Design a protein around this ligand. Sequence first.
Ligand SMILES: CC(=O)SCCNC(=O)CCNC(=O)[C@H](O)C(C)(C)COP(=O)(O)OP(=O)(O)OC[C@H]1O[C@@H](n2cnc3c(N)ncnc32)[C@H](O)[C@@H]1OP(=O)(O)O
Ligand SMILES: [Zn+2]
Lengths: 263, 57, 316, 316
Amino acid sequence: VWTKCDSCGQVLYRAELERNLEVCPKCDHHMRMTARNRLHSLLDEGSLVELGSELEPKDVLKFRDSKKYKDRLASAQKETGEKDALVVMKGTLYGMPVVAAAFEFAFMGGSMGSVVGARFVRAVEQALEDNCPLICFSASGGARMQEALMSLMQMAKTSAALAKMQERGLPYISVLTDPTMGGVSASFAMLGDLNIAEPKALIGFAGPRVIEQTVREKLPPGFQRSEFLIEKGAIDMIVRRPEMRLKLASILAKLMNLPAPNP
Amino acid sequence: SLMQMAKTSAALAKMQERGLPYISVLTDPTMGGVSASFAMLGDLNIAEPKALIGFAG
Amino acid sequence: NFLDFEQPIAELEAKIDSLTAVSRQDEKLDINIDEEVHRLREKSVELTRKIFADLGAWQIAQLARHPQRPYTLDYVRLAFDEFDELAGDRAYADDKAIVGGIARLDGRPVMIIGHQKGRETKEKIRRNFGMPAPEGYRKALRLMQMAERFKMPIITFIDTPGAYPGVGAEERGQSEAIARNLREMSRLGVPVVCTVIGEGGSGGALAIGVGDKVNMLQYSTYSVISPEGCASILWKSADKAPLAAEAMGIIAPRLKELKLIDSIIPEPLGGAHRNPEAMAASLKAQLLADLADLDVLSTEDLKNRRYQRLMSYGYA
Amino acid sequence: NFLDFEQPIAELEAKIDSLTAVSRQDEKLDINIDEEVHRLREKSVELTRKIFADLGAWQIAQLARHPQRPYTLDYVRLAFDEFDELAGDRAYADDKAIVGGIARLDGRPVMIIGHQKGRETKEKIRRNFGMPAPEGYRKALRLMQMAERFKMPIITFIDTPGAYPGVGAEERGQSEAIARNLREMSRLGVPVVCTVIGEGGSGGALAIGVGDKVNMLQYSTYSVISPEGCASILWKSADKAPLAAEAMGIIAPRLKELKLIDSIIPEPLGGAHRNPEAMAASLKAQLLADLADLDVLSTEDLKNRRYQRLMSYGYA
Ligand SMILES: CC(=O)SCCNC(=O)CCNC(=O)[C@H](O)C(C)(C)COP(=O)(O)OP(=O)(O)OC[C@H]1O[C@@H](n2cnc3c(N)ncnc32)[C@H](O)[C@@H]1OP(=O)(O)O
Ligand SMILES: [Zn+2]
């Protein structure tokens, strides 16, 4: 019950950190948060309804690099307790119906596979049939390499679903957590109406190592961080996690012309 | 004179939503409000060689 | 820092401040000091009233550049609530010269786009003295498209010398950015209300000023080019700016009779700098009236009216 | 410059050239030299037929990167006429890595967007080795929107290692450019025919490859990441690329059975580099066939079919 913040090397009491939403009360470092806990914190109490819980990894390519891909899937499912990275949970936000999605970065690095795209499309469909905003918390290392193009094409599918939502005129706020790189930053994470991002979140398309290899130089200080991106225009605003719920509620109320949420 | 930029741009929008092409040829010089109203607003922006094009002198 | 011709007003205000400090210092001479303060307060009101009775075009132009004046952020603070600022054009960078966001106007959510010159020298150099790079007009267009998507009215404040004439700003298509803003803004399916608080013109102000209703403060200028530039090109001198300002007709009442703007918002006595709260309240009332009589029109009828208004500009 | 495993073919071609020179030298022994040339040509044909009987995934990947191969400009020259090249995204710069334009396909006007690696080292460094900056994907989106405006079909060539992972390219929203291209391309009201000539992937290839009909040459690869990268991350080595290529399934027949691509265009013997004209003719025939059965569908039905096809990707 005594954890430590690696950024500052403190001895944060675990419950104190947990009730602050996994943010160090000393340096305000945003650490890992599980998808289910994040959705519970975001959405109201007692209104959560998970969606796309019937979808499971069904490896067909029979991939094997150094460990069996089925073994990797089973190990991740045992460690995280979730069938795949993305977790969708319909709910209500300050009395306003909403659909939210959250990545689980502990599941194979939060990579995007077929089930991730299928669950995202399920969330979009649920939002469309019952008109309500969509919120996504992207934490991914890219596209699932063990599924080859079956993961690459998930970019186009999610983008098309978002295009349908835009045609209908519904909001879609994309919260960019740490890290959000590869095929998730390039398909639907940076495709939202507002690209909110948490402080000091590593966001980009290609990882820093490949950029260093190609350029063979020193990257600019604070490269690909949220504070560096907002000056480059790729991020609409930066919002701290404890303030995320109220900020999102107010923004979605303003977009949807609903009365302001009660603080 | 300044309000003519908005007028020309609105007319070009009207003809664009119909689908009719509008090619803009830029000759020496194309500066000021013309460059910012309809000269740089055509579907094809064609410029003659060594033409002085911009917004400010 | 008041202007050259407002020195008497500054002296009276300075004397009032000195007397207030002296009154707070002592207690046995409060009555006489208070009487003098009341007498000097009446003097200041009458002096401001008589000076402003007849102001030339150059006087108004100097007022529009007063280095103490409510900017877009001040109006947002004093007339809007729950303002969330959106930054970034998604391509190159977010221009600090243009501040945009979504806020509530008496409960109704609105989109706010306007230039921000900055108060002190640090903010002035951070915001390029209110002169926006093309990545500012692209951000403005993005915000306007977002507002039009969510059936949201747009409110624009026009307070800027003009587009930045830099090498970097010119390489990134200043003209294309302005032209796209002008073309897209005539098709928005939501009402647009534009006011010209402060100084605007050069075409970098019209880039966010193609609206259903165009308003202008009493002491605000709106010209195709700064008086200094017009004098330099035509009069072959820079000191003949007042003649250029008089000839162009950059003052609000002059433009109103030309059917170029819809209404003029009266300012507090002594300009909007004396009582910014009153100026904000008057602007808010005018904005509410414009939205009230704009919502009756349908989207198609609103767009048709906007188009016809544009086609009526000029004598031909 | 043939590959490592095609050395016998290079030797045979050199021998053919030597025999031609010898024939040009003399006149009294032309018949026998010509007969020997024909015999060696038949030998080369049979050898090429037998070598290509069983090619592994790494062999196919090497073929797709042959430094002698028709690029987008070559296919345009050999299968399209009256090609006018449009350059510029209107914002930052025109990316040489993507070459776009409007041309005619058997009289019918089409829009052509595709990557251009470049022939020699000079063009390779001028075109960033076919790796496009975000201002290339923005140009592609602009051209696609233009084509959709004038009821024009779109043809896309996908031949690139991937998006450029540079500091400048990353600062200007590479991810945003790719995402906007993917989102807008699913709503186009005109048929889109995409082919994967050469090497494509990493998501910078899908940015112009969301089409109604997806085609791929026999010896072309299309993967989420280059085999080298997959090996480096998973196998913990760079020399184990062939195992990664085999496991991923980056070859055309492997992808076809997954319902990921629509058809495969057979290539001339010895790859598309031996006889580019035959490859261009086959590609043109395939494009015409794909357009013929796409024009029957209405715009709404075409868009519905495109949307349903996307939702069927993956096992979930
Ligand atoms: C081409 C693509 O879209 S996939 C290419 C890989 N991703 C990229 O190039 C973009 C970013 N590259 C990265 O290496 C990371 O995502 C970074 C830069 C954010 C670093 O984050 P890190 O804290 O180093 O996370 P890391 O990479 O270790 O991810 C954790 C786990 O997820 C795995 N993982 C992450 N992304 C992927 C992926 N796309 N496919 C398969 N496994 C993946 C890693 O192998 C790792 O597993 P392990 O710990 O059991 O060895
Ligand atoms: Zn800490």
